């Protein structure tokens, strides 16, 4: 019983962790570029208005 379940678990965990590591990283990269350019635009906007 143990021998079965332990295996199953190992495979589950490895796939999950590696897939999330692979995808979330680039998703956050994109989000961060968009955040950065928006922040630059807002600073430029405020300074221009003032």
């Amino acid at each position: 019983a143990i021998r079965v379940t332990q295996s199953d678990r190992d495979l589950f965990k490895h796939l999950i962790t590696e897939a999330t590591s692979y995808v979330s990283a680039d998703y956050m990269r994109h989000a961060n570029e968009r955040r950065t350019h928006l922040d630059e635009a807002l600073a430029l906007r405020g300074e221009l208005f003032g």
Partner: protein, 79 residues
């Protein structure tokens, strides 16, 4: 060196095929029987040499499959 099992076959696979449990199991498997946890002998055997059996049966164009519930069975391909 020559005349050495490794030339033709992995040692673990030959060790499995030489076991006394293999003919029974083979016969049954081919007939479509599913193998669960209760028939210890068979199940344990399956577990011990899983990958060798899979590789073996592959020759036939059939998949030796393991369901999540822990039971083994044979699924033939189109070929």
């Amino acid at each position: 060196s020559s005349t050495h099992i490794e030339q033709f076959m992995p040692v673990k696979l030959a060790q499995a095929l030489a076991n006394s449990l293999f003919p029974e199991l083979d016969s049954q498997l081919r007939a479509g029987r599913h193998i669960g946890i209760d028939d210890l002998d068979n199940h344990a055997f399956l577990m011990d040499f899983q990958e060798q059996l899979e590789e073996f049966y592959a020759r036939y164009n059939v998949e030796l499959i393991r369901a999540p519930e822990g039971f083994f069975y044979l699924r033939p391909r189109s070929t």
